[PDB]
Amino acid sequence: QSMYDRHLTIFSPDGNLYQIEYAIKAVKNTNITSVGVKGENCAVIISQKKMATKLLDYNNITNIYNITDEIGCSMVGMPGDCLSMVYKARSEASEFLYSNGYNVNAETLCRNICDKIQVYTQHAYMRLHACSGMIIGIDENNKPELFKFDPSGFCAGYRACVIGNKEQESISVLERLLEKRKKKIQQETIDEDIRNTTILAIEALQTILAFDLKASEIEVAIVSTKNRNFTQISEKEIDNYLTYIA
Amino acid sequence: MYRNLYDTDNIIYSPEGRLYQVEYASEAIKQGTCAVAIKSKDYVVVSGLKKCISKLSFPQEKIFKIDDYIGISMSGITSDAKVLTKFMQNECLSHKFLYNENINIESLVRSVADKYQKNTQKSSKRA
Amino acid sequence: AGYDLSVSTFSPDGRLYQVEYIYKSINNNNTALCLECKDGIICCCINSNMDKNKMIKKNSYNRIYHVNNNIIITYSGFDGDARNIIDRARSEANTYYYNFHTNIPLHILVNRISLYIHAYTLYWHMRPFAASIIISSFNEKDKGDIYCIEPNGACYKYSGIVIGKNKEMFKTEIEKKDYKDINVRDAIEDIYKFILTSNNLQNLVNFSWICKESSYEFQNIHEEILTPALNKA
Amino acid sequence: IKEEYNKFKYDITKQAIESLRERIPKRIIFFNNLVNVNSEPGSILNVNDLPSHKQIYLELEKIKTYASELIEIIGNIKLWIQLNVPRIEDGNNFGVGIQEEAIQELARVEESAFNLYDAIVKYYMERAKISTKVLKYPNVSDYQEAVRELDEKEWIHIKITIVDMRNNYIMLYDLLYKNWEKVVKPKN
Amino acid sequence: IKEEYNKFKYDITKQAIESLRERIPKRIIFFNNLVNVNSEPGSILNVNDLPSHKQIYLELEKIKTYASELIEIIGNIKLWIQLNVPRIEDGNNFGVGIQEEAIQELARVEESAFNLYDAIVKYYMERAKISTKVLKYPNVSDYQEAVRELDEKEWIHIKITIVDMRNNYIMLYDLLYKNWEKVVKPKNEDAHH
Amino acid sequence: IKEEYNKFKYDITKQAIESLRERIPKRIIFFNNLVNVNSEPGSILNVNDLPSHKQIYLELEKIKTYASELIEIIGNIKLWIQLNVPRIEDGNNFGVGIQEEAIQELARVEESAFNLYDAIVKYYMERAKISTKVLKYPNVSDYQEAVRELDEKEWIHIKITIVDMRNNYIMLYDLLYKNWEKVVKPKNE
Amino acid sequence: IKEEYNKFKYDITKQAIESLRERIPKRIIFFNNLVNVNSEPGSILNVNDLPSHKQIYLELEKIKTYASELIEIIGNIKLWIQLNVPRIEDGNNFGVGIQEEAIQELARVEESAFNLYDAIVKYYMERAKISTKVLKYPNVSDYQEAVRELDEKEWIHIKITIVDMRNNYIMLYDLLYKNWEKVVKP
Amino acid sequence: RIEDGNNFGVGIQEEAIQELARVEESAFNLYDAIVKYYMERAKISTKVLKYPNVSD
Amino acid sequence: LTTFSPTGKLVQIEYALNRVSSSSPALGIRAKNGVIIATEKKSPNELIEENSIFKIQQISEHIGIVYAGMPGDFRVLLKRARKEAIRYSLQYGSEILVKELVKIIASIVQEFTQTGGVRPFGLSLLICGVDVYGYHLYQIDPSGCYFNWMATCVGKDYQNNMSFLEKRYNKDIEIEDAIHTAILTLKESYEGVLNEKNIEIGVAYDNKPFKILTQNEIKDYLIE
């Protein structure tokens, strides 16, 4: 029947915003996943490089967008809504420099994005932005930071999180992968986090996607200390890390 | 669920892919009188047939004038055709004032066709 | 239960209806085509609207537009709504030329045009655009690149792409010959052979190529090179 | 076969226009001469001029002729409108609605004419049953009155049927004539 | 078992196209040759050419054959459309409505042909009861008139059945021909990836 | 008590999945092998292969077997969907719409199979009444053709029932297969 | 009396909870042991175990008991939901729809159980009429076939009724369990 | 008095007449229903007299 | 456009109150030497770091707030709450009074009900803090009204959760004694029996600045 989900600013009898609820299903319907995990003095984002459901140049299609030279982020969901969200973030992070001098913090960037998102929720101005992403980046405290935001307002932040269509089949796997490094050996920190976290990150993606995970269909980025650049790891290093599973 | 939902709004699209509100306007010009123009090598003649509504009435004008070398002939409703005439008159006369050359024909119709476009995406103004 | 009315309404399935109908709107209009070559980027545009008018001029209905001397743009869909995007494209080049005194690059124009089309989708009162845009260029050092902008953003880099009423037909004809390393002067004769497969011997297909080492700038159709069409093989 | 079929599509179209321009007006004059509109009240639906009843027998036979010709004329017209229905589309299909009203009106008259064949059999069957009762109960006069009443009831009903024939022919003709442009070409 | 199912989808599809390209057109001309549209009014549906009634008996036997051929042909075509209905989704389901409209018409024609078998039983049963009354009451003449009138009713109805047969055959062919694109692909496959 | 009840919910679910993966496809091919779709028109619904009519009697017994096995399989499928309807909420019940539509279709086929038992009783009862009239009035010949015609009607009805069996089995299998994802997980957060 | 009346509403409430926690689950297993869902096809709906028919008589008496116990349990449950309906107001009455949906299905099963009383009378009435005809017309064989088929029909109907019992009990229990929070405080 | 709008209270009244009439119609049909019991029981009993060995 | 109803009550407000009736339970209790607040932090997993997601935020050096509804709305109302704690602090050099602050946020929530095309706030606030007129613990309703409570709960199933406070509360309770009667109103109230550093508790801390109690600090009280 004609239920109460027509507009976006109208509550339901039980009290649920169904326009927001349907917008989260838009991200789960794009069948594009991504994993983000923060370890010691580093954090990485693993993309998937797939068309949001011939002759397409695969180097152009991606799900990683640097907001600044220090704060990078990923995007999923509808390709139209995710592109405009980066521009509503690049024009915001750069605005922080012109209005406050310092570079924007990773935790302040996500909370400032959610403030604009919440405004479009209470008002019937525009449609919701069917997207999600993992904002990555280190701060002035020399600590890595990761933050995930849903189509609604959220500044959760996780040490390891999965965004995409498989969030209901990955917490049972990421908890074990995180446990495979925290309560395990944990010897020292020889600044070899790439061989310690990213190896224990790509392994998490292989446990989610049952494919062989071709190196020409995956691209990661690191924002660790001594680098500080959100550099996209080259193809040769990606294929080299894929053979480390043996 | 069809035939009556995607019909009265200039925003909604049909599931087939046709803007049915704008498509009625294309048929709305067919209720008007006939007109015909002939393009020769160096001349253009426009024949317009007026419509005497009554014996006591006078035939309403069909062929108009815009400039010395530009003249239009509406075919449809007199309400919106007069508005486009004033928009085409203020546009071409401004070109002879801001500059001294005459206004290019295709550069004029590009402004007139754009006037239709501005009255197609807004929900308030119709086509 | 009728949820595809406005553009701001999300379907319960998760899809975004009222914007997917636009793909069914561009699937009934005339087609456009483009492809990469080792000497340039040859474009194409078939206007399959011959059975009703037959009074228009031969080379009047042109659907090839350029923002400046080195970036071409075509339409596929509502020809009226595409005029507004070209106005936003040329103004984007001119605004970029004032603030930066140089030609606007391709990877920064496509990202600004796709934002303009996507911006009208979010509104509850403005109707979305109904025109798919093909943006291409050909660098002197680097090779060409064709960006395809469909409704609801989604800027994608291609190497050959067709959009219109036979997108599931001409796509199979391009993957046969590797057009990445052939020429432009021979591909133009091959393009005219494809149109004859899928519907008469008419010159209603106007198209230009951006580069034939002709200063690497957007030329015209050059009728003398188009008239020796291999109409039989 | 494709040729024979296209000829078939051509042959129906001919019959429909021919029926509206000639066959239908001719029947208007026919039934009007039987039930003149200028008649004073009561001179038609009366009973003054009314083993089996040979008089009712001859009148019912004429009715079946009138009934046969009605179903035949409307039936080809109905098929003709159906073959002229355009492809089903969403919106701007007001004209199919016009077509639908015509098919509805044609089916209504056809169903009406169709029940006359069953109703006439029922008249004699019901009348025969009462007559059987007269043989069993010869002094109850209402059974004899019932015989009288059966002919008088059917006689009134028969003429209203004839009036309905006349009235149906004009209502179909007047409706299609006024709405002719949308019935043939509902779209472009 | 997986093989038999895919084989079934292939064999049905063939039968549906075969019926529309051959089985249905041939029968159109057949019934048309029996009740030609170009006949002048009153020359078909008349009674001039009119124990059991052997004349009426022979005509019902042909009807039952005609009834048989319609249900078998339409039934597989109807089933084919049912197997072609896409997954149910909210919105953009204009094509299922077309499909649903088609299923509605196929079931309409099917119920019509199906009731002929029941209708034939009622004819003989009702006629037999009245005849019993004629044997019991041989002088009430209206019962004998009722028998005469009954045959003329059944005779016209036979032709109405043949015309309805004819009309159903053309409406099915015309509907599928005009709406062919939406019955096969009601929802275009959004081919990404 | 809690254990035996939970065991029941597991035991039904197995039977339901088993039916879609084994019981339903096997019966589709079975009935199709009896009434092949590739047959020419009139070769199915004919009367060439046609006291009581002993030939018709043996055929009705087979029909009841087909009817019995059908209600049991679909009934468990129907109950399984009933156990799978989520908690009633306002909105976001598109999957419930699939479920409601599915229950309607399952109940429609079930009601269809259910009237055959009553229809078979009606066949013998109606035929016997006419037969009584033939015994009382042996020379009015129309009563004897009516008996003959009744069997021919029933013979057609028997075969149309068998095709309807075939068509129902496939319509049930394809519909659940295409909409399988919404039948198991309609909302599930 | 006002105290006794509120006590009555309390007394209903007790019976409703007692029925859902004890009376209803026990009967689910009860009817299931007679018609197990795990049975192979045809082992339930067969006719191998099938003057008046003394065998059928024994099966109907048990059915009437099952029908009796069902109407009594559900009737108080319906009343229990009815006493929990809030004051009539305009709007914000989504919960009453749940209450209404539950009472209608409950009334449906009650009506279903109610028609069994009518259904048992029709079996004997129809069987009695045919039996008069077989003694009067002993060579028309279809009357004897009608007796046989009626019993075969009734046998199938008896077992499907038991299945319908089973299925109604679980769907009723499952519906109230899932919607428990809204039935008491809508 | 009947008015357009702000007539939510008449709906309760309408609901009340409906509920009161429903119970009233239900009790009212019992007098006719009791006649049906005796008529049907007597009719079957006549058949018992005519066919005394059919045990059903 | 959240209009009226024939019964004389807002329907969108009643629907908004159902959202706060199905969220995490928030609980505040005043004392004679400070005010305490608590919130059952429903930890879904170990990925969410506790120092990021919070339910107790600050408004100034003496005002504490608690959320009870739509988590996406836990920041927009906070931004305008801190902005009002600054606009009052710019003109008036002293601290913002709780009654002066709660009447402004109640006015902000109110304007989101009468304005056309807007949605009411899906949350219930709990403003608490030290004031120059004693202590205070207010509760803001999505309708816009505010109550001067003493000890209350606003989360899920508060009809029976307040019953613990109606019978286990005295007018003169110290802040240290009120902690265990608040934990009892959380652990012994409903599910969430594994209360091991999964409860955020803020206190006024006897006229000192607002202190957010750490996990190991609450562990000293979690042993009982």
What are the tokens at C111? 């990202």
Tell me how far apart the alpha carbons of residues A242 and A202 are, in angstroms, rounded to a whole number.
8
- Listed in sequence order, the residues at least 6 apart from H9 whose beta carbon sits closer than 8 Å to its beta carbon are none
Identity at G141, one-letter amino acid code: S
Please report the beta strands in chain A, taking only residues with DSSP state E, as ranges in sequence order: 34-38, 43-46, 64-66, 72-74, 76-77, 131-138, 144-149, 160-163, 220-222, 231-232
Closest CA to A169 of G100, B38, F185, I152: F185
Q: Which amino acid is at A219?
A: E
Residue in E20, E12, E16 with CA at minimum distance from that of residue E169 = E20
The DSSP line for E17-80 is HHIIIIIHHHHHHHHHHHS-TTSPTTSSS--TT----HHHHHHHHHHHHHHHHHHHHHHHHHHH
Instruction: Specify the CATH number of the domain C1-233.
Output: 3.60.20.10
Burial class (CB in 10 A: 0-12, 13-18, 19+), D32: middle
The answer to whether C and H touch (≥3 CB pairs < 8 Å) is no
Which residues, 6+ apart, have CB-to-CB distance to D85 below 8 Å? D96, D99, E178
CA distance F16 to F76: 6
SS3 I89: helix
Task: Answer yes or no: are the C-beta atoms of I44 and I59 closer than 8 Å.
Answer: no
As to burial, measured by CB atoms within 10 angstroms (0-12 exposed, 13-18 middle, 19+ buried), residue A72 is buried
Residue E134, both tokens: 């004629």
Domain assignment of residue A237, given as a range: 1-246
How distant is the Cα of A234 from the closest Cα of chain C, in angstroms? 20
Q: Rounded distance, CA A18 to CA A60, Å?
A: 34
Task: Report how far residue I57's alpha carbon sits from residue I65's, in angstroms, rounded to the nearest whole number.
Answer: 6
- Half-sphere exposure for D52 (CA within 13 Å, toward CB): 19
* Exposure on the CB side of residue A71, measured as CA atoms within 13 A: 25
Residues of C in contact with E191 (CB under 8 A): 168
Provide the number of structural domains found in chain A. Answer: 1
Q: Which amino acid is at C106?
A: L
Q: Three-class SS string for A66-118?
A: ECCCCCEEECEECHHHHHHHHHHHHHHHHHHHHHHCCCCCHHHHHHHHHHHHH
Determined by which method? cryo-EM
State which residue of chain C sits closest to F93, comparing Cα positions. Answer: C12
Q: Is the CB of residue C193 less than 8 Å from the CB of residue C173? A: no
Greatest CA span in chain F, whole angstroms? 76
Q: CB under 8 Å to D38, separation ≥6 — which residues?
A: none
CB atoms inside a 10 Å sphere around CB F33: 10
Q: Tokens 């409903």 label which residue?
A: I190
Structure tokens at H33: 């229903």
Domain boundaries, chain I: 1-224
Q: Which residue has the tokens 């087979």?
A: F62
CA distance A81 to C124: 15
The whole-angstrom separation of Cα B104 and Cα E191 is 45
Question: At what resolution in Å was this solved?
Answer: 3.8
Q: Residues of H with CB below 8 A from G125's CB?
A: 44
D117 in Cβ contact with E148 (< 8 Å):
no
Q: Specify which residues C123 forms β-bridges with.
A: A126
G and H touch with 3+ CB pairs <8 Å, answer yes
Distance set, CA E152 to CA D118, E3, E53, E156, F28 (Å) = 10, 55, 12, 6, 46
Compute the distance between CA of residue C43 and CA of residue C146 in angstroms, rounded to an integer: 10
Which amino acid, one-letter code, is at E25? P
In the block, residue with structure tokens 């009233």: H24
What is the rounded CA–CA span in Å between residue A170 and residue A208?
A: 7
Closest C-alpha among C63, C66, C34, C65 to residue C48:
C63
Query: What is the homologous superfamily of the domain I1-224 according to CATH?
Result: Aminohydrolase, N-terminal nucleophile (Ntn) domain (3.60.20.10)
For the record, the structure tokens of A192 come out as 């070899």
Distance CA I72, CA A121 (A): 9
Nearest to H48 by CA among I52, G132, F62: G132
Kindly report the length of chain C.
Answer: 233
C-alpha to C-alpha distance for C133 and C74, rounded to whole angstroms: 6
Report the Cα B99 to chain-centroid distance in Å: 26
Go through H34-44 and write b for each residue having 16 or more CB atoms within 10 A of its CB, e for each that does not.
eeeeeeeeeee
| Chains F and B lie in contact, requiring 3 or more CB pairs less than 8 Å apart | no
Q: Which chain G residues are within 8 Å of F87, Cβ to Cβ?
A: 178-179
**What three-state secondary structure class fits I131?**
strand
Sheet holding C160-163, edge to edge: C41-46, C31-36, C160-163
Query: HSE on the CB side for D51, CA within 13 Å?
Result: 5
* Amino acid at site B71: G
DSSP string, F122-181: HHHHHHHHHHHHHHH-TT-THHHHHHHHHHHHHHHHHHHHHHHHHHHHHHHHHHHHHTHH
Name which of C124, C159, C171 is nearest A126 (Cβ-Cβ).
C124
Please judge whether A14 and G92 are an interchain contact, meaning their C-beta atoms are less than 8 angstroms apart.
Answer: no
Burial of I42 (0-12, 13-18, 19+ CB in 10 A): exposed
What is the CB neighbour count within 10 angstroms for residue G181?
A: 13
The CA distance from F177 to the nearest CA of chain G, in Å, is 22
- In chain G, where are the structural domains located? 1-186
Domain with residue A4: its CATH number is 3.60.20.10
Which among E159, E153, E151 is positioned nearest to E51, based on CA atoms?
E151
Distance CA D25, CA G77 (A): 71
Cα distance from N-terminal residue to C-terminal residue, chain C: 53
Contact by Cβ (8 Å): F181, E90:
no
Q: How far is CA H56 from the centre of its chain?
A: 29
Sign of torsion, CA C14 C18 C19 C25?
positive
Residues of chain D that touch chain E, judged by Cβ-Cβ distance less than 8 Å: 1, 4-5, 8, 11-12, 14-15, 23, 51-52, 57, 60, 64-65, 68-69, 71-73, 75-76, 78-79, 82-83, 85-88, 90, 114, 117-118, 120-121, 124-125, 127-128, 131-132, 135
Chain E hits for F152, Cβ within 8 Å:
64, 117
Residues G172 and F84: beta-carbon distance below 8 Å: no
Distances (CA, A) of I205 to B39, I36, I128, I213, I223: 93, 8, 12, 10, 21
No. of H helices and E strands in chain F? 6, 0
Do you know the residue count of chain A? 246
C77 exposure class (CB count in 10 Å sphere: 0-12, 13-18, 19+): buried
CB of E81 closer than 8 Å to CB of E106: yes
- Report the C-alpha gap between A70 and A85 in whole angstroms: 18
Query: In chain G, which residues have their Cβ closer than 8 Å to the Cβ of H56?
Result: 51-53, 124, 127-128, 131
- Residue I206's contacts (CB-CB under 8 Å, 6 or more residues apart) are I33, I34, I175
C12: chain F residues, CB-CB within 8 Å? 92, 94
**Does C contact E via 3+ CB–CB distances below 8 Å?**
yes
Reference G128, options F58, H50, B125; nearest CA is H50
Q: Do F90 and A21 touch (CB under 8 A)?
A: no
**Residue of chain A whose Cα is closest to the Cα of I75:** A115
Residues 6+ apart with CB under 8 A from A154: A114, A148, I71, I72
Q: Which residues of A81-116 are buried (b: 16+ CB within 10 A; e: fewer)?
A: bbbbbbeebbebbeebeeeeeebbbbbbbbbbbbbe
Question: CB atoms < 10 A from the CB of B68, how many?
Answer: 9
- Rounded-to-integer distance, Cα G174 and Cα G172, Å: 6
CB of H12 within 8 Å of a chain I CB? The answer is no
How far apart CA F142 and CA E126 sit, in angstroms, is 10
Q: Residue A131: beta bridge partners?
A: A77
Distance from CA of F94 to the nearest CA of C (A): 6
Q: Which of A28, A33, A25, A29 is nearest to A209 (CA)?
A: A33
Residue from F87, F90, F94 to probe the interface with A (highest A Cβ count within 10 Å) = F90
How far apart CA A133 and CA B81 sit, in angstroms, is: 51
Task: Write B100-104 long-range contacts (CB < 8 A, 24+).
Answer: B102/B67, B102/B69, B103/B67, B103/B70
The answer to whether the beta carbons of residues E155 and E56 sit under 8 Å apart is yes
Supply B6's token pair: 């995607």
Q: How far is A187 from I135, CA to CA, in rounded Å? A: 51
Q: What is the DSSP secondary structure assignment for residue I118, as one 8-state letter?
A: B
The helix (H) or strand (E) run that includes residue I149 is strand I146-149
Measured at the CA of I149, the angle between CA I143 and CA I155, to 5 degrees, comes to 60
CB-facing half-sphere around the CA of H20: CA atoms within 13 A: 6
Residues of I in contact with A10 (CB under 8 A): 12, 119
Q: Residue C138: which H helix or E strand, with range?
A: strand C133-138
